[PDB]
Design a binder for this molecule. Structure first.
Ligand SMILES: O=C(O)c1cc(O)c2ccccc2c1O
Ligand SMILES: O=C(O)c1cc(O)c2ccccc2c1O
Ligand SMILES: O=C(O)c1cc(O)c2ccccc2c1O
Lengths: 516, 519, 514
């Protein structure tokens, strides 16, 4: 009955592309849980159990963005809906395929908040398990057809806009699917196409933010790329050089969210802005977005005096940051961010906390080509980054495992503030039988704050003892140790603490601004 | 004045966005937008329609949107006025109609304070609406007049790009709430503040036409030249891709190995009966992100199909024979039937149709009765509220579609008579939406509208002088026999007229059983 | 099967006080349609069917406010929820016990957003499990849940009545003896006292949903029509600008009359809001305090009482004289005529635009008569069917008195725009109940307080009633009183044409005469 339909949707979930499922122990959602662990024992899926329902949501977000695959979370309590709120809100604004699973009880009379209405791509409730053995083969099709609907809506198969989905199974040999493990209803990924005429030769600077696509025809133009954005060309432009120049056009890739000059440039009424997104949503600053497109058709090529003015200032800004950082006495988050950037090698995965770390890496001018950079930029919360990295590693390392290469699994390196660490410190607690990453190292830049009693809050938390209590490898190191100790393999998961200073950081940026 | 500057700006961008008609319902909080709309109508930039009842006003907008294809905006005040658009918004959702509900509201600061005519307005429609966008309360800040304009125009384009499906390929209703307590110019050349070019959603799919395949064309289906030769059971509101029709009654008598499902087929229990048959694979080809669960065995979904081979000529001859067999059963029993029924009048209307006409059907019986008579849709624009298939607003939707089709013809510049718009509705739907006939003297009236009502008890009792209704709203009405329908429809008359045909609902079961028995 | 659940759910409604259920035919069969038919045939409930879903909801509102009992609406279509919106919003803002019935089938899923904002509670019964042994306890939970719906609808525990959504998913088990409800919940006594000094010059503004306060009977009170009067010292609304009250007592939820809002929004006048429910209104946040009753200190200054009564008389005369001096027949004249024709025990239903204001200007005395208006949202829709429902519930309660005297007449004064809005509500099948003493007075003027501001429609109201087989007469104002006394059909209308052009001149004369 109920268990027959639990096993069938799990088979179709795997067929649809689901590889990892997150789960919290609770009273409800027992039959679906058993069908999951049946598949986890077999090895068709990998199961992850956590106590904290909040961090499980972010863990699922990590598993999703790690390999770009749909990930499920199993709700088993009345607290789970509220706790998964933060993760579901991120998955909505970051377009992360997150399938939230529930088991409502329909034979009882008549909790849930209203964010499910605003955040979720589709709230789909399956039918009740029926005692109609003659019709079960007919009930199979709808169960597998409905499961394809939540998979298509989560991955944005027809909308080109991935996001979270609410899947509800009511609760009072398995029927086979199609041959060759194919999904019941196969919908190929849609190609969302919308061209836009753009005269390249006009002085153009390209701002690529979160969710940005790659356009090879824009590879030559000078581009200010956020860490999370992929890079189409090899002509970088530092974010701090932007005020020095006065562009006449701006191509906007995705959802840029960083840097005060970017906000003012896109808001300038005299400068027209063209936004190129991969999904139906398009951003605007002060309503200055002039046109929206999937891609741009390009007429001409920019004049090299523009090209060389930008390229010179780009070197001017990068040198000013590199020079002024060396001049500074104490180690700061910008120094720590620069330390991680120099120590990175292609094939790595980089996870950044959504506060200062992502900002600082851009200031350090990190080159991201060959690197996969992940950050919870949809809502920009300081929550759940520890679990996001753990999940990102587990999804990334799992791809290498299936890849079959006999290589050391790629490193996953995370950079988070102390406030981010303490928030999600509970994400470090993992059961012995639950999957644990093999090459994850979380750099914690402790500055006792982020960016006098309220603005910055001191906590005096012993990060080392906290890591010790959860049975994870920790080591307090100085800046120069980072690059060396990152290369040296240790435990599969380790936390590297680096002390930092805030008082000196304020003057440092003034010195950076004075050398420009 | 902030409220008037806001109103005149969002009206300008809506006009720039392709809004040619605007339905308006007057009230206290409606003033700033009502003035802005009047200056746009008096200047000839839009054609405004004032209606008294908001519910039928929303349906008047649906017709204006489907008759030409442009986004239509409606304006009303706070309170029960916006609630009256529930039924219209619900229909626009399932029918993908670019309806911009523009509501004036007392400031949100007053919500919960007990102020008269205020309610939980924003989000009233919930998930039925494509997007609920709220304009900021226009603040007294002339130092930012150049900045407030950009955000106002940028937001209006979002309302327009959402209602028309400019980037989602999924049109539908949008809730635009504006609280209220030289006009700043837009872009040069009259272009939208934020331009959105034509979008394409593409999902090709390998389909083998050699396999015995039938096509089921539903509401909102696209035209696919690859499938023009296949036998298609096409609903009236579905555009026909070819000249190989298949009657729906013929579908159960055939054995297809394959079925292509265009749009959203709703009609016909046999279609639903066949869709559940698992052995036959189903291929759903839609135009937008939505695709129907009417079949549980849907193998795959897409936007278009790439074909391999061609259907066997034996298969084509089999279906054509069955199609002719089903039409003959309908013809023979209808002629053999002594009395005149709702199917009789439905067959008469279809025969009097000529290419270039616009057919508007009551969503319950007429659509079924027209498809059973097997009307040829080619060259004819068939409109019906098939989103929710409610009895509401059929009259107003025919009126708007007439006004939209006629006005679109006047823009062609061709110097001939405006094309006919004739509608077929039952008495029950007619008496319900009788409020829609009421058009003010200054408001646009259709030039060639003929509402054909097929009166019978029901279709529980009601006895109603249909002529007295039309007299109450000053609409010319004559009562006709079934055989005189064609000639009267052929002879043009007033700009808007009603033709009532008395029909009998008793023998409907006797007639239907004969057709099923004649197969 | 599920019919046993349906049979007991209706039984608890009848036990709880439901006496009228409104129904519409639709796409899927009605929730508990069979159980209602038998109760209708047995005479335990009266049943009204309608084709228009929007009219049906407003009809139920009248059925609820006519006598004060909860009323159910059973709706069975995809357009059903959208069409009840306006009536449900009105029920919420007027605190009307309206129950809405649903029957969702939970064996696949995936309704507007107003249901969360408007209904006092949303309860769905458990699906009827097919098990005979546990039906003893299953009867109890069924009847426990139906009482919850009733208690939420009538505000039995919350003192705030309103709309409720009840969903029943798809011999009879007995209730408690003596036909009493399963879960007995008595009407709660919501109490909140407030110290008010009556020595200070105080005026009382009583609006929709106000309560009666005998200790406040002495004060001069500007009372809306739908407000119950608690004293014999009235004060015309047009005397308010000529007075300087140092205190204002706000009974209920006032809406009408510009001067009250100016006085209620005065920063320098303390406003004490006395309500019968948890909600309280404010105008520009000037409500210094809230309560349910007043504990009084002192008495009003006789000079203050003198002046108030003096200005009340002066305002009474100004409108009566300018009404007479004015040549043409305005909407104020028909409103004044209807007011003079009323007799104690009558029921009056007022359209939400000018009629509810105009009868207030004519100085109507509501003592002894029951006044009704859809003031929660002040909507122009559903007025004729609200009157129909009010007349039906009113006559039914009078019929339950058993008295031999003729049923009390229900009179309704509505504008033309409100008439054509709800014209469809007139079509009532012979199968359905029809009022016996309902009289509808239509003040026709092609709009009321210019292509947009006023909508000229030029409708034949006589031909429209002819169409719906309703008795109609186009009389004059002088003859309104006599025709109104002489009884006619159970449902009859009287259309009196009125001019809007002379209105600006007439109101100016009253301003000049004040
Ligand atoms: O392109 C993206 O990835 C993207 C993602 C989002 O979550 C957005 C939310 C609001 C507006 C625009 C958005 C957007 O362009
Ligand atoms: O493509 C369409 O026209 C269309 C439109 C809709 O509103 C639908 C609603 C539910 C299910 C399928 C739908 C569909 O296929
Ligand atoms: O007492 C009433 O009738 C009543 C009714 C309402 O709907 C209110 C809404 C907001 C604030 C006060 C309210 C109020 O006092």
């Amino acid at each position: 009955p109920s268990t027959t339909q639990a096993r069938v949707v799990v088979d179709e979930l795997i067929r649809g592309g689901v590889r990892d499922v997150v789960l919290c122990p609770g009273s409800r959602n027992a039959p679906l849980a058993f069908a999951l662990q049946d598949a986890d024992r077999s090895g068709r899926i990998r199961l992850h159990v956590r106590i904290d329902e909040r961090t499980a949501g972010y863990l699922a977000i990590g598993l999703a963005i790690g390999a770009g695959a749909p990930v499920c979370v199993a709700m088993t309590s009345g607290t789970a809906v509220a706790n998964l709120g933060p993760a579901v809100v991120e998955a909505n604004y970051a377009r992360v395929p997150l399938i939230v699973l529930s088991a409502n009880r329909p034979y009882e009379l008549l909790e849930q908040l209203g964010y499910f209405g605003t955040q979720v791509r589709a709230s789909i409730s399956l039918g009740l398990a029926e005692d109609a053995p003659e019709r079960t083969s007919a009930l199979n099709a709808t169960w597998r057809s409905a499961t394809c609907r939540v998979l298509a809506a989560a991955t944005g198969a027809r909308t080109a806009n991935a996001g979270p989905v609410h899947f509800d199974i009511p609760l009072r040999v398995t029927p086979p699917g199609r041959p060759a493990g194919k999904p019941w209803t196969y919908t190929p990924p849609v190609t969302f196409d919308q061209p836009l005429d753009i005269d390249l030769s006009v002085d153009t600077v390209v701002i690529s933010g979160h969710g940005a696509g790659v356009h090879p025809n824009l590879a030559a133009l000078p581009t200010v790329a956020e860490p999370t954005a992929p890079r189409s060309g090899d002509n970088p432009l530092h974010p701090l050089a932007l005020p020095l120049l006065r562009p006449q056009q701006v191509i906007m890739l995705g959802r840029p969210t960083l840097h005060r000059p970017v906000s003012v440039l896109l808001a300038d009424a005299e400068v027209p802005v063209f936004a190129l997104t991969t999904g139906p949503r398009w951003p605007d600053v002060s309503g200055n977005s002039q046109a929206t497109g999937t891609r741009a058709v390009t007429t001409g090529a920019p004049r090299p005096a523009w090209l060389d003015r930008c390229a010179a200032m780009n070197r001017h800004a990068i040198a000013a940051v590199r020079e002024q950082l060396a001049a500074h006495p104490l180690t700061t988050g910008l120094h720590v961010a620069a330390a991680v950037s120099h120590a990175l090698r292609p094939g790595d995965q980089l996870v950044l906390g959504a506060s200062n770390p992502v900002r600082d890496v851009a200031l350090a001018g990190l080159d991201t080509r060959g690197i996969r950079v992940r950050s919870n930029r949809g809502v920009a919360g300081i929550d759940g980054t520890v679990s996001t990295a753990i999940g990102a590693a587990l999804a990334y390392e799992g791809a290498h495992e299936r890849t079959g290469s006999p290589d050391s699994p790629p490193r996953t390196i995370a950079l988070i503030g102390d406030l981010t660490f303490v928030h999600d410190s509970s994400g470090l607690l993992i059961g012995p039988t639950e999957p644990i990453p093999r090459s994850l190292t979380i750099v914690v830049s402790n500055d006792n704050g982020g960016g006098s009693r309220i603005f910055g809050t001191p906590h005096d938390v012993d990060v080392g003892a906290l890591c010790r209590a959860y049975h994870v490898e920790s080591r307090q190191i100085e800046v120069d140790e980072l690059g060396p100790t990152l290369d040296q393999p240790g435990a599969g998961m380790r936390v590297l603490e680096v002390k930092a200073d805030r008082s000196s950081l304020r003057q440092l940026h003034a010195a950076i601004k004075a050398a420009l």
